[PDB]
Design a protein around this ligand. Structure first.
Ligand SMILES: NC(=[NH2+])c1ccc2[nH]c(-c3ncccc3[O-])nc2c1
Ligand SMILES: [Ca+2]
Length: 223
């Protein structure tokens, strides 16, 4: 997260870290056995880490559970990143409490102007790599579709939305991929891509979760 602040241990109880010997992506807990992340974060050998704050120290509240299966959306395109969403089922359910909690799926899409919270352990520099130990937060608004399409002409599908600051300085970055964009208590986006990090006129692009709620409910219901 570039231009963000330290969230505070366990203030974001639905944030998960996807780990394969190191942190590589974020994700959101939506029920005690399912996590939603981005299809480009897929790999085998994923351990889901819940109740995390400092990812390099065990401090208490952490739950490490291995993933039983990862379901990348059947229509995910790795060249356009359209349908960039993946569901991970956990080997055992997580114990929920106030430090580990699920986030709700939306009942409607959000409008531009809505302010949202983006969090993650990804890069905090736009030029160079500086990964934090603790979780960083950034509050960003959803931009209008014209500013998003004018920024990435021909690269935005209707399953993507832009959120961020056109003046630059604040944005999500690598390491944040797969993580949450929560607005008014609902999971509205997933960190998917952007051109560099925090660059002027290059806002972040997120998977528009409101378009996958029926798919998520049907896939969890049949697995
Ligand atoms: N500007 C953003 N909001 C953003 C978000 C996620 C990213 N992930 C990446 C990224 N991911 C994997 C390898 C290199 C990257 O620059 N760039 C990213 C940029
Ligand atoms: Ca820790």
């Amino acid at each position: 997260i570039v231009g963000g602040y330290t969230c505070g241990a366990n203030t974001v109880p639905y944030q998960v870290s996807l780990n394969s010997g190191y942190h590589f992506c974020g994700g959101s807990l939506i029920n005690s056995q399912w996590v939603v992340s981005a299809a480009h974060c897929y790999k085998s050998g994923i351990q889901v880490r819940l109740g995390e704050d400092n990812i390099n120290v065990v401090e208490g509240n952490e739950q490490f559970i291995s993933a039983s299966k990862s379901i990348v959306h059947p229509s995910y395109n790795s060249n356009t990143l359209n349908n960039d969403i993946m569901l991970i089922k956990l080997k055992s359910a997580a114990s929920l409490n106030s430090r580990v909690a699920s986030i709700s799926l939306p009942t409607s899409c959000a409008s531009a102007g809505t302010q949202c919270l983006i969090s993650g352990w990804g890069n905090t520099k736009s030029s160079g790599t500086s990964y934090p130990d603790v979780l960083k937060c950034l509050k960003a608004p959803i931009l209008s579709d014209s500013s998003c399409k004018s920024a990435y002409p021909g690269q935005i599908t209707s399953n993507m939305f832009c959120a961020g600051y056109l003046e630059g300085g604040k944005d999500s970055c690598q390491g944040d991929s797969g993580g949450p964009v929560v607005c008014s208590g609902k999971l509205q986006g997933i960190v998917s891509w952007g051109s560099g990090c925090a660059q002027k006129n290059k806002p972040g692009v997120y998977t528009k979760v409101c378009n996958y709620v029926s798919w998520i409910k049907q896939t969890i219901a049949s697995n």
